[PDB]
Enzyme design. Sequence first.
Site, mmCIF file in Angstrom:
data_model
loop_
_atom_site.group_PDB
_atom_site.id
_atom_site.type_symbol
_atom_site.label_atom_id
_atom_site.label_comp_id
_atom_site.label_asym_id
_atom_site.label_seq_id
_atom_site.Cartn_x
_atom_site.Cartn_y
_atom_site.Cartn_z
ATOM 1 N N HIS A 1 -5.259 10.007 -5.168
ATOM 2 C CA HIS A 1 -3.700 10.629 -4.693
ATOM 3 C C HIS A 1 -2.939 10.520 -5.960
ATOM 4 C CE1 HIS A 1 -3.092 6.011 -4.273
ATOM 5 N NE2 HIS A 1 -1.884 6.542 -4.613
ATOM 6 N N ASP B 1 -10.972 8.397 -3.107
ATOM 7 C CA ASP B 1 -9.769 8.387 -3.581
ATOM 8 C C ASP B 1 -9.897 7.830 -5.138
ATOM 9 O OD1 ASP B 1 -7.083 8.258 -4.301
ATOM 10 O OD2 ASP B 1 -6.496 6.560 -3.324
ATOM 11 N N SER C 1 -0.974 1.623 -7.861
ATOM 12 C CA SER C 1 -2.164 2.627 -7.415
ATOM 13 C C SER C 1 -2.772 3.341 -8.571
ATOM 14 C CB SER C 1 -1.355 4.048 -6.519
ATOM 15 O OG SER C 1 -0.776 3.509 -5.553
ATOM 16 N N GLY C 2 -3.800 3.564 -8.631
ATOM 17 C CA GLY C 2 -4.597 4.107 -9.632
ATOM 18 C C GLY C 2 -5.148 2.781 -10.882
ATOM 19 N N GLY D 1 3.126 1.777 -7.188
ATOM 20 C CA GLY D 1 3.322 2.005 -8.801
ATOM 21 C C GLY D 1 2.217 1.482 -9.214
HETATM 22 N N1 LIG Z 1 -1.016 -3.187 -0.890
HETATM 23 C C1 LIG Z 1 -1.809 -2.007 -0.884
HETATM 24 C C2 LIG Z 1 -1.145 -0.725 -1.717
HETATM 25 C C3 LIG Z 1 -1.089 -0.461 -2.943
HETATM 26 C C4 LIG Z 1 -0.376 0.588 -3.337
HETATM 27 C C5 LIG Z 1 0.445 1.251 -2.431
HETATM 28 C C6 LIG Z 1 0.326 1.195 -1.023
HETATM 29 C C7 LIG Z 1 -0.324 -0.103 -0.554
HETATM 30 C C8 LIG Z 1 1.127 1.947 -0.472
HETATM 31 C C9 LIG Z 1 2.092 1.147 0.513
HETATM 32 C C10 LIG Z 1 3.264 1.996 1.371
HETATM 33 N N2 LIG Z 1 2.064 3.025 2.119
HETATM 34 C C11 LIG Z 1 2.071 2.621 3.490
HETATM 35 O O1 LIG Z 1 2.712 1.666 4.020
HETATM 36 C C12 LIG Z 1 1.094 3.408 4.241
HETATM 37 C C13 LIG Z 1 1.159 3.072 5.886
HETATM 38 C C14 LIG Z 1 -0.125 3.780 6.484
HETATM 39 C C15 LIG Z 1 0.153 3.807 7.776
HETATM 40 C C16 LIG Z 1 -0.849 4.072 9.001
HETATM 41 C C17 LIG Z 1 -2.258 4.470 8.546
HETATM 42 C C18 LIG Z 1 -2.256 4.594 6.915
HETATM 43 C C19 LIG Z 1 -1.323 3.988 6.047
HETATM 44 C C20 LIG Z 1 1.364 3.903 1.573
HETATM 45 C C21 LIG Z 1 0.503 3.006 0.540
HETATM 46 C C22 LIG Z 1 2.122 2.644 -1.557
HETATM 47 O O2 LIG Z 1 1.279 2.476 -2.769
#
Ligand SMILES: NCc1ccc2c(c1)C1(CCN(C(=O)/C=C/c3ccccc3)CC1)CO2
Lengths: 242, 242, 242, 242
Positions: free
Chosen positions: B44, B91, B194-195, B192
């Site tokens: 992603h 992913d 991520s990856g 941030g």
């Molecule tokens: N702690 C783990 C983590 C690591 C890195 C990272 C994240 C989470 C994000 C947090 C914010 N985001 C959401 O809140 C997604 C909500 C969601 C609602 C319903 C169904 C699926 C998903 C997207 C992921 C941004 O990057």
Amino acid sequence: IVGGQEAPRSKWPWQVSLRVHGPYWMHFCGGSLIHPQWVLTAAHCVGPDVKDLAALRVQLREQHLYYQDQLLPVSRIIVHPQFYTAQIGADIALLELEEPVKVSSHVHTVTLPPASETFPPGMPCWVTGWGDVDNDERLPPPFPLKQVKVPIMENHICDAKYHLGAYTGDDVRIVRDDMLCAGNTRRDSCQGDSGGPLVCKVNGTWLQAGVVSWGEGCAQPNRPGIYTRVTYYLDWIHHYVP
Amino acid sequence: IVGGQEAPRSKWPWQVSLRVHGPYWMHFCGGSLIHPQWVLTAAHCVGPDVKDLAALRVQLREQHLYYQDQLLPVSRIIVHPQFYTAQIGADIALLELEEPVKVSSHVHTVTLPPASETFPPGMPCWVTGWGDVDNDERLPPPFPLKQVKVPIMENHICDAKYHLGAYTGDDVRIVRDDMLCAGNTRRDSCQGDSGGPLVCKVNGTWLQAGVVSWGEGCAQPNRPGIYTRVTYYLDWIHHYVP
Amino acid sequence: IVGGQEAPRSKWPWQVSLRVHGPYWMHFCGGSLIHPQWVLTAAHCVGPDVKDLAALRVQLREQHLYYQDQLLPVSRIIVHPQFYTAQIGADIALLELEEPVKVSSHVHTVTLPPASETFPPGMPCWVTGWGDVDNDERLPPPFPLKQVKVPIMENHICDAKYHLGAYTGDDVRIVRDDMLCAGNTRRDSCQGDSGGPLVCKVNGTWLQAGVVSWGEGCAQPNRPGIYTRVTYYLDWIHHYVP
Amino acid sequence: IVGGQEAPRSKWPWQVSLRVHGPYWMHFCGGSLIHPQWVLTAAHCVGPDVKDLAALRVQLREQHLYYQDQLLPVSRIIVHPQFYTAQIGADIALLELEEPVKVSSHVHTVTLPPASETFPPGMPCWVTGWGDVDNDERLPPPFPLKQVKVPIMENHICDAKYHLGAYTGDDVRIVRDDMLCAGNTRRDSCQGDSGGPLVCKVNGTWLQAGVVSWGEGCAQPNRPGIYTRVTYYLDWIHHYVP
Ligand SMILES: NCc1ccc2c(c1)C1(CCN(C(=O)/C=C/c3ccccc3)CC1)CO2
Ligand SMILES: NCc1ccc2c(c1)C1(CCN(C(=O)/C=C/c3ccccc3)CC1)CO2
Ligand SMILES: NCc1ccc2c(c1)C1(CCN(C(=O)/C=C/c3ccccc3)CC1)CO2
Ligand SMILES: NCc1ccc2c(c1)C1(CCN(C(=O)/C=C/c3ccccc3)CC1)CO2
């Protein structure tokens, strides 16, 4: 709504606005009245996380958002158990109104399509709502209801279109069978239109083919708007709506 | 990174930073060096939409982001063909550096885990990165690399927890077999990160158990961080990496 | 408007809304009709940088901003030549409508004060507008016109108030002779109310004592709102307004 | 700084950064060391509202912000009694460091100008700081100190420029005698540079001609940057600084 125009006041008597509590009762998603006591909408507007009923209200057909609100309480929220994200599918949900609606000439239900209706390319369809008029661009006050005519396309084409300019394997399905595609680079639904209805005039009857669900942006090339395919979920709807 | 502390300069010599062309070469995702010429990251971060190799650069371990940049061009971006969203799975992605890295003093590869490693709860695992320090809270300058020790939680338990307070049927899998769960309300990865790598010390050696993928927020009740399970994609990785 | 409430439909027939061209004709300041062809407003709403008249329109009294707009073009902008900033002074300007307005009953002019008028301390006056309801807090749709009763504060007393918690020398005048103070930590004008009228009922007649000009925040301790004192500029007004 | 370049590490040893307590000690204004224990800055950086000393720190010359901080406590804030707004004037202040600096080679006070130095056009002058690189465009990480050569413009000529495209009367002075003008549409100071040094090389020596004060935007047509004229305030400075 991207492209299109302000709706005439006699059209789309089934359109509703969903409001969330805050500094004011703010529009957040559309919906459609499919029974005097039931609203059809998208699940991603209310789930997958369960929220407090008291903080949600429904506004019926209204030419300009907020002008003369008459907010209606909800007694039940019913989200498809298969729903988690819009891309995975089952993006559909029902709201039971605390009380049936005094059905008028200005406000009444939309008809659900027979299980057999496929809505092939060529059908005349409109999507309506109070959502953004383009990417990152809000509907300006006084927030008139908008409508746009959108072209429908077969699922295999919409799915293949989504693989253009993407890493995803051509054999890996993106647009599922419970979805339905419509729109182009000038006509589309967008954020705030979610949950609202895509209707098609079939044999003199407006049928609700779809529920605004998702897409990559709005009116972007090879990324038509994706709707939940109402016929797919007739069985589920009928477990709850008479 | 939510919780934890700034990393010692000697720790995590495999951590990399992905940069995108703009006003400056801005960090958007983390990654790990698994081969002198290969970087492992999340899909992603670089998809599903196809990107231009030119607007991308890679930065090898730095104590403080941006402060001693030696940016590295990439000749290939390889994204798992099964990927479309992080909730659906697959992913994971590979970046081939234009040229091999000369294993420096603070730059070494991370060892990939044997297919036998399930990483049970109780193991010592750290996630590292320069991401948000909490929901919608940026890492402050001078942007030190952070690390936090995260409790591993079994997939089936983690899956059921993701259903807590949701409409989604207990029937429906949310945390999938190609995923792994770690973190609590005080320790997590965030936007941030991520990856980036999740690493566990096993029998005197650090193995990369996961790639930071997604979650519902960061450090939220009953919503542990979700990672791509590296053992699940060894075959795919080995198809490309010597 | 900070505090107070929605204005009844019969009140303040002189209040107007200044609109700038864009995505929509957006309200940026208030003003008052002082003559069928002239609107009194604040210089800082339309200066000191010279504006394009084609980008400006006037909207006579409306219960709700934007619902039922009837925008009037402007033929001349006249900004007091001593104006550069609101702290320096001379914060007043005149807009000439391209056509005389049909004076109605729910659209009247407001009476300007006689050259002598003082408006003594404690006296209760009214400030109206569609401005923010608090610091960084927009008036929620449908944007009802707000009114609030604010107590006059004698200049010297007000000036001292502005020195409390400041470095500025006591002998340095912050509230000046062409200014007028009114309001408290509960009742005040705010961003978006600028250019609008402060009115007082003197011997049975509403006179406009001031023009909403500036202040250190809205309704903050020891910082009453500052208005431009109309009596100071009667001569200048009458050089243009029949 | 708009235009210009990163400064060599050996130059501008007197440059300081002012920091406020937040998620981190964030840079908000510049300043210059004019005495082992005294920093000269702008009043609008610290006033006119009285501020808590324990919320402020001074950072002596750094090549990159935040990178190698050694923050220094302040014992006194002294703001010119006549200051209220920068457009009104007297935008000058003095910070007393809790203890004298260990004047090394990388840090060294700047020399103030003799009262009679006027700094006419053609004179070589530079302004330095860590401020914005353009309107609404922040200095990117890793926040190098920038420099730019600015053309000096006679007050009366500068004043005239400021009247172009403005409603302000020709006889009304915008650029006052305690101010100095410099810069053009390619070279100028900007937000975040305020309080920092404008230095000119006179007979082989660097003299601080100005303190970054204000302007209409940065590098806009007919709006040179405006600085407090240091010569004007020698007497007040010497009443505090040995
Ligand atoms: N702690 C783990 C983590 C690591 C890195 C990272 C994240 C989470 C994000 C947090 C914010 N985001 C959401 O809140 C997604 C909500 C969601 C609602 C319903 C169904 C699926 C998903 C997207 C992921 C941004 O990057
Ligand atoms: N015109 C159809 C449509 C209607 C309403 C509506 C939208 C699209 C959203 C547009 C913005 N969003 C995205 O861009 C999603 C990106 C995405 C990336 C990768 C995999 C899947 C998805 C979320 C959907 C917001 O609300
Ligand atoms: N209720 C009075 C009032 C009415 C309308 C209105 C305002 C105040 C503004 C509030 C926000 N602003 C400030 O806080 C100015 C701070 C300031 C700092 C230092 C020296 C002078 C002034 C600008 C004026 C915006 O519009
Ligand atoms: N390059 C000179 C300069 C240096 C530092 C610095 C600035 C300008 C600011 C730029 C933005 N600002 C304005 O635009 C002020 C508008 C204004 C309108 C009407 C009458 C007076 C003034 C405030 C000053 C921010 O800090």
